[PDB]
Amino acid sequence: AQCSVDIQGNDQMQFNTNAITVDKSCKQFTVNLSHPGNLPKNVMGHNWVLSTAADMQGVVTDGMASGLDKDYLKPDDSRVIAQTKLIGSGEKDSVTFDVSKLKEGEQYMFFCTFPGHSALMKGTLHLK
């Protein structure tokens, strides 16, 4: 079975995937984030952060306030289910989390927390 997805965040402030449906049989799910292009993390950093649909705005806003040195995320934010590092061009990072953290009927959102990125960067996630 497929329990992984490869996602790219580029210099155009776009994710190449904006919808992920996780199979219920998967024990763990993996997101492999990469950054093709030429721009560094201080100006075009991208992360893949997962929260419930209701918690998205709060994670993004409190993330902007945390700054670059904290990867634009409130440290150990309880609303964050899974997160990758903030990556620049030529860098990559993967995050694997337990599918038991996802509930039937609940809606999740994945997004980048770099200031302003979430306007285009993102997508929906839920159990298949």
Ligand SMILES: [Cu+2]
């Ligand atoms: Cu970004």
